[PDB]
Design a protein around this ligand. Structure first.
Ligand SMILES: Cc1cnc(O)c(C)n1
Ligand SMILES: Cc1cnc(O)c(C)n1
Lengths: 227, 221
């Protein structure tokens, strides 16, 4: 059995986290998540779905549940970029980790969600260094528009044009125009080479500022470093 | 706690736990125990970082210096940790360290929360790692020295990280100053930040043992 001292760690572990059952009905949410989602007491989440929270995040509950069902049906964990207006009147950005929740015999019985704030330390501007065979190099242009920057960021995290068009609220053909502009600016011969050239220049380290005021919930491809 | 809450607590992601004011472990989750070589995670309790069955203990003094800073300031810090582990492999993590408070709000220790270094974890700390004339060119070792200088490592600490002599580090330091046109270490760091080097983690550091604070943040009252 846990001591009260250890239970205080359960109460104080940072982040925004909880678990849901197989129908994405909340089973627990910590106090930080409850306050973020507009509730006075986080216990008031229990028995509700994402559609039923007093929060604009509920506009994206279908996407949350599609992510949950993917975790449940494959057993894979995902990382989700979540950008929403919240009942406190501010836009927030988080990465939510979603993993299977298992019972005592190892069977999947729901999902665990674990969110961390994206701070200004993650919204830097792109530098001017380039990966080399050894070390790095810099000069002494790749100036991108807002839409171009948003398309590039999503491409670098594994998103297809159909995903990007749905995230940005534009047509697939419009995304292809931005892809072509990006390929020209980077001098890339292919979409795959565009990704390589952009990654070697630090474009993966920067969330475009205009993305921080677009409501979205999108799984980001995630791989260990190094690999 | 209810049965569901205990189950959730045992399965929350990450590598985490808490330590008292002397950095003696009070709790570690199953993932941290397994990572550190203690499959029965309760075996962590009552030990310090010096007493774990892991090559990480070579950096226990640095872990405790970080803990004391969190305890004395109330700030949170994010730490880049790269260590060999008892499974025989190098692992890189971001460890976030936060004050642990008692029922009356007094700091009683630290909470540590580690995440595997992945694409999204490094995005969260605003850095990036490389995968596989008028131009300024850094070599692998120059970039290692510049990175460690950027985050406050002494030449002797840099020598220990890179396994080289302190005279060799001073040679790299002098080469960096000429390429950047700096006349001192402070001008060098200032010029490297202006060109955006503050977001780089040299890829060769992923197989060198280090524990480096990347950021320190005020927690709002
Ligand atoms: C804000 C948010 C986004 N995705 C989720 O799954 C939850 C529970 N909350
Ligand atoms: C691996 C590691 C690094 N820093 C720490 O403080 C702990 C507890 N573990």
């Amino acid at each position: 059995h846990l001591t009260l001292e250890q239970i205080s760690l359960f109460k104080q572990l940072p982040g925004y986290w909880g678990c849901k059952d197989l129908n994405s009905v909340f089973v627990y949410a910590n106090q930080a998540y409850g306050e973020l989602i507009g509730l006075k007491r986080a216990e008031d989440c229990i028995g509700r779905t994402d559609f039923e929270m007093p929060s604009p995040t509920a506009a994206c509950a279908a996407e949350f549940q599609q992510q949950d069902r993917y975790v449940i049906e494959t057993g894979h964990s995902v990382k989700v970029l979540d950008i929403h207006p919240y009942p406190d009147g501010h836009w927030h950005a988080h990465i939510f980790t979603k993993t299977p929740w298992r019972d005592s015999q190892g069977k999947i019985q729901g999902t665990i969600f674990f969110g961390q704030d994206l701070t200004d330390t993650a919204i830097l501007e792109v530098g001017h260094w380039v990966c080399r065979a050894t070390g790095l190099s810099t000069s002494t242009t790749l100036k991108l528009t807002a839409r171009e920057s948003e398309v590039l960021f999503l491409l670098l995290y594994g998103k297809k044009p159909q995903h990007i068009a749905r995230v940005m609220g534009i047509s697939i053909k419009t995304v292809e125009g931005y892809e072509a502009k990006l390929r020209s600016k980077f001098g890339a011969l292919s979409k795959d080479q565009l990704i390589d050239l952009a990654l070697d220049r630090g474009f993966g380290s920067v969330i475009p500022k205009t993305l921080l005021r677009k409501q979205l919930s999108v799984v980001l491809s995630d791989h260990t470093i190094p690999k």
